[PDB]
Design an enzyme around this catalytic site. Sequence first.
Site, short mmCIF file in Angstrom:
data_model
loop_
_atom_site.label_atom_id
_atom_site.label_comp_id
_atom_site.label_asym_id
_atom_site.label_seq_id
_atom_site.Cartn_x
_atom_site.Cartn_y
_atom_site.Cartn_z
N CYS A 82 5.41 -0.03 2.77
CA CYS A 82 5.98 -1.34 3.05
C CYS A 82 7.28 -1.25 3.83
CB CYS A 82 6.21 -2.11 1.76
SG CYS A 82 4.69 -2.47 0.89
N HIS A 102 23.11 -6.46 -2.19
CA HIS A 102 22.59 -6.02 -0.91
C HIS A 102 23.29 -4.73 -0.51
CE1 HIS A 102 25.82 -6.83 2.10
NE2 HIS A 102 26.27 -7.61 1.13
N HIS A 156 7.56 -3.12 -3.08
CA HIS A 156 7.48 -4.14 -2.03
C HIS A 156 8.68 -4.08 -1.11
CE1 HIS A 156 3.93 -6.31 -3.41
NE2 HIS A 156 4.39 -6.21 -4.64
N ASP A 187 0.81 -1.22 0.00
CA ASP A 187 0.00 0.00 0.00
C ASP A 187 0.84 1.27 0.00
OD1 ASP A 187 1.01 -0.20 2.54
OD2 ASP A 187 -0.89 0.05 3.57
#
Length: 242
Positions: free
Chosen positions: A47, A209, A235, A44
């Site tokens: 996240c 990462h 996300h 939404d």
Amino acid sequence: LPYVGDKEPLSTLAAEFQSGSPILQEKIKLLGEQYDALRRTRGDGNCFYRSFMFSYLEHILETQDKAEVERILKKIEQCKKTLADLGYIEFTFEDFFSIFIDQLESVLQGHESSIGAEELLERTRDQMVSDYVVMFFRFVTSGEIQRRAEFFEPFISGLTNSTVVQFCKASVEPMGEESDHVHIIALSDALGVPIRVMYLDRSNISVNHHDFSPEANSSDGAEKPYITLLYRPGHYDILYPK
């Protein structure tokens, strides 16, 4: 549909992309060799803040690291001063601070208002608590960016074409505006908690990462983060090492 999901094995993420890009499928496979579980958040636009809220509170719940709570409470108090120095009057944020601080206390054991793992999840799924904790992180992130506006200015105007306060009012403070690396630098700097983000994207194939921490974010030049998030466009989900 819940704000925070239940733990799933990495194989469900793998099944979700079984007809997706082969590069993403291989990165997911690599992910499954180092991580046992994934916890999704509802997509939404909150996240990063919502996954951070849960994984941090769950980390305190499981470790009972009272010294860490005392450390962040001191940082939270100085976040109150940065917001006040910028002209935010207390009624704009006081309910966000008090609700998050209540969760910090509730997750430590040994007193009347202590809670367990089930009630914690229940609270992160309740809009009238979850959204207030998210707004706390948004206000804390916005204050830290503005406090160091001159440092953030070249990066923000290279990403967007706006000023720092414009960026904060348009894309940090409003609910539903998803976080980018500027949010994550400012939050991890403001609260002093390291965050590892794994990037499930299209760039030998490896999962890139980055560790965000007061040490790693410093411009002059540690301990592996205990919060690991998985990033995809739109996300942020929580990863559990194995």
